[PDB]
Design a binder for these strands. Structure first.
Lengths: 99, 92, 87, 96, 108, 77, 96, 104, 91
DNA sequence: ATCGAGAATCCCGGTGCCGAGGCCGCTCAATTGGTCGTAGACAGCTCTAGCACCGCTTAAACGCACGTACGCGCTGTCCCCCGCGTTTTAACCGCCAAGGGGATTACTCCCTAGTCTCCAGGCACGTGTCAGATATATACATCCGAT
DNA sequence: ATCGGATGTATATATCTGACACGTGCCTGGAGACTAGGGAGTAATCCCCTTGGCGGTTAAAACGCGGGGGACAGCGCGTACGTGCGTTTAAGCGGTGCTAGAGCTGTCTACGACCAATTGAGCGGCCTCGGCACCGGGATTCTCGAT
């Protein structure tokens, strides 16, 4: 008997339902903290952090990226593409006044 | 050391709208965040209005005006009605 | 006097499947692989601007430690007001 | 640098940069472009045109106006060298 | 002296009209502050609070939860045109986003 | 009344906007958008006018309105 | 008889109206519109002439930038022709 | 004497101080605050006028006009960053066509 | 009567380009720019004051407000200029 | 075309916990209740800028024709993305130890506000010219077939 | 492809007018020279919360292997939009004239600030318990590859 397999993109729809249902953060905690610390250490030495400050940054960044990807989604859809491409982000950010 | 918050007034309002219902501390922190922001928005525009009209005083007129600028229509009208009613009651 | 190991290249720790989960919450069905590095760049810039101003509030406070309020102020002036950490 | 001064530099002969790129280089360099050899200071082209020798370049040769390869533009857009010597460095006019 | 009575109680409000007046003075917004202002402001804030918490409490009830959580707030906010317009540039910690998929992406 | 925003004016606007080619459906849509944009500004402007107890709108009312609506215009302060 | 090709004069028009700064809508009907809009927020209003001018500058500016976004939307859609969906996309991305 | 003269500036330091006080920004305004602020404003003024003057010279005009300001402000990245949400009366836009729209 | 920055702007114009004039509409726009930037700086300086419970806006607030508002090279140059002007005013 | 595996999802029920709700001391922040100076509400006057309406010109908008090139429905084919199995690998969690710096308190004084007297920087408003708008004729730039 | 028709564009010369560049009269707001009350600077002290690191588990990430459906190059063909001529119309302009109301001046007094006595309100700490989470098993949904 052939093993079961979902059709391509069917699980991606299930994944959309999943991560749209949950509130939970999506990035690996400590790596995100390491990145934030790395970036900060480029502005001034030995900078210390409240735990809360890190969590708030991850919330802010994830939310920003998510809304940005929604615009990106529309940009591909308007281009009749099912699939997102860097140009979608660029276009959206340009319309947004980030560029 | 001593802090302050809106939280009890929010909780009383909560009991009034939904007697049976509670709220998380993080959600209450969000409610405080909301009260702070909207307060600050109103107060800034009230200041600007007073400044543009050379008035030393921020008054009921400023709050009413600031609300009429800041809020979408029906939300603003309910808010205007409430604030007016509270002022007339307070005056009595 | 006891520091952690120095930080380099942690932008790669922002994983492909994490970026995908973010895009999935953003309702994206199908993803070109070119997105990952571009996203990393955008995120890196986005972070940097907030962090610099946060550090600027920290410096004005004469602090060595960044607070959540520092983050909040940075975000608010950068037009991305976050509820959940005020006071 | 601004090594040119309103020099009405003519452009001809299948240039690999577009006319508006070449104009931007010339005019960043303090110049001006032209289509008219009669009021041009100089002209720039692909070497292929000094092989083709179209009436347009022939008018420039009959004006004895010095002419140079397109990488002249790259060089002046990159270096402060005396244009007199850059004529030699990029020369397509044996004339002048 | 008479028995002490709150400006909030005279206003018929839960929000702290007295604290509001204090904050208005110390907030440097103007040289002077007319007594109707803190009342009107308090009433506005308290109304907006109620308007939020009504819909958030409904969202919680719909979710079979008896305690309000950040998800409910965000949901209620995006599900009203007026709140969403009031809060459009605002982000909510642990709010998530509206469950929403563009029809072109669905199976045939 | 809004139809007084002429087709060729909309074209000239699109031309300053670098647009090459134009669906006719644009013109009515543009009029709709313009009307909304005007309305939001004007409402706040009139609100400043009324707050000022004026019957006459000032350019400053427009300035303050545009500034709070995030579109600060230099040249009329 | 003579003709230009389609779009050629349109590119000439872009050059015209991008080189120029003149207001593009007719003054009188723009004012007429503003007044009837205002009548719904309050009766019996009046205006500084400068406020009308300031409004027109603002509106034309808002429209121009929005049209550039619209142009970019069509371009991203491989069209050279703008369509209402371009505006809608831009306005949605702008958060209007 | 004048406060601006001790500062070596054209901007009116006294008017800056008085503005700061009546602008309600604080209970108090330390003496160097208006001096620093004046210098910032004056510097930015100079940076703008410089570039607008260059633009006017390129336009072969002896007088600065709104076009020149807009042109300068959109040609410099840092000015354009500082002024992105600003609009300028009689500025127009940068002459700009997307390459896709051109012939061939 | 009616205040403006205009004469100071005019002296700056004379400094950078002696032979160059300005239109009334442009000078109006200059006043708009000055007003805007003054308000931005002062508002952030006020916020810094609140955020640190300080009664007083000082040079340090202005320097910081500049560091928040201006992009890089403008901020550096403005900081240098303000520091210089303060130094000269102090002497 | 509609019908079975079977994969994922959502639904009852026992545990149990730990965050939310609650109650009590109790500090300071609200209220109470008195001044008082000046903000500002209100009357008055005036002149200016906004509003109305008129006739004439000509720039503009419009209305109609037409063709080309643009949009766009359809097809092929190539691969780059999704899905799924194995691997590894590093994120995660607990708990531990050190000590930097955030937080608070107490002191002392430098300095920003405030006050009066003085006066020149800066403002209002006359006025002369040269900057530049407006042709206008002219010499370039560049588009478009037709070859 | 070049080559010349055309027409559109940018460039000399005049000119003329009127905006801005500058001068004078003058007043008010800056500023010089005081004073002091308290903001905030600096020191000291506490302890808490941040930072580091180690060992163990296992969730997630990485990694590799199909394969199909989405991206997109080509393309046939239908119209709608660009260019251009002729029509008409209403924007514009410069005029006139009106008077509403915006702006300045002036009076008078309502009420927000300042101080000071009082106390209960809201905050901080310490209970205690039920809404929620959590498996865990069980019922329902929905998908796919058959048909």
């Amino acid at each position: 008997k052939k093993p079961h397999r979902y059709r391509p993109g069917t699980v991606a729809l299930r994944e959309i339902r999943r991560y749209q249902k949950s509130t939970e953060l999506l990035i690996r905690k400590l790596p995100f903290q390491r990145l934030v610390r790395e970036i900060a250490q480029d502005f001034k030495t030995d900078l210390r952090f409240q735990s809360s400050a890190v969590m708030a940054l991850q919330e802010a960044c994830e939310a920003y990226l998510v809304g940005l990807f929604e615009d990106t989604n529309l940009c591909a859809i308007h281009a009749k593409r099912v699939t997102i491409m860097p140009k979608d982000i660029q276009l959206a950010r340009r319309i947004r006044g980030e560029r | 050391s001593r802090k302050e918050s809106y939280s009890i007034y929010v909780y009383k309002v909560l009991k009034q709208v939904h007697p049976d219902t509670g709220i998380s501390s993080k959600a209450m922190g969000i409610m405080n965040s909301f009260v702070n922001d909207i307060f600050e928005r109103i107060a800034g525009e009230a200041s600007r209005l007073a400044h543009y009209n050379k008035r030393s005083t921020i008054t009921s007129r400023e709050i009413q005006t600031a609300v009429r600028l800041l809020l979408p229509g029906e939300l603003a009208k309910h808010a205007v009605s409430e604030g007016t009613k509270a002022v007339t009651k307070y005056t009595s | 006097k006891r520091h952690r190991k120095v930080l380099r290249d942690n932008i790669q720790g922002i994983t492909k499947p994490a970026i995908r989960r973010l895009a999935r919450r953003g309702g994206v069905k199908r993803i070109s692989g070119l997105i990952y590095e571009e996203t990393r760049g955008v995120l890196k810039v986005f972070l940097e601007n907030v962090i610099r101003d946060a550090v600027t509030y920290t410096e004005h406070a004469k602090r060595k430690t960044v607070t959540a309020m520092d983050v909040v102020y940075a975000l608010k002036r950068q037009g991305r007001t976050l509820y959940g950490f005020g006071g | 640098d601004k090594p040119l001064s309103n020099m009405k530099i003519l452009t001809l002969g299948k240039l690999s940069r577009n006319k508006d790129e070449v104009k931007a280089m010339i005019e960043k360099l303090g110049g001006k472009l032209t289509g008219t050899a009669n009021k041009a200071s100089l002209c720039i082209s692909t070497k292929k045109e000094v092989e083709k020798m179209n009436k347009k370049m022939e008018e420039v040769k009959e004006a004895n106006i010095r002419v140079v390869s397109e990488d002249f533009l790259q060089d002046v857009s990159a270096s402060t060298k005396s244009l007199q010597e850059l004529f030699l460095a990029h020369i397509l006019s044996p004339w002048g | 002296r008479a028995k002490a009575k709150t400006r909030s109680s005279r206003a018929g409000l839960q929000f702290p009209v007295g604290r509001v007046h204090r904050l208005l003075r110390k907030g440097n917004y103007s040289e002077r502050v007319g007594a109707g202002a803190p009342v009107y402001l308090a009433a506005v804030l308290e109304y907006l609070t109620a308007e939020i918490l009504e819909l958030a409490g409904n969202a919680a009830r719909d979710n079979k939860k008896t305690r309000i959580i950040p998800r409910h707030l965000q949901l209620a906010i995006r599900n009203d045109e007026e709140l969403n317009k009031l809060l459009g540039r605002v982000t909510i910690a642990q709010g998530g986003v509206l469950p929403n998929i563009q029809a072109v992406l669905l199976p045939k």
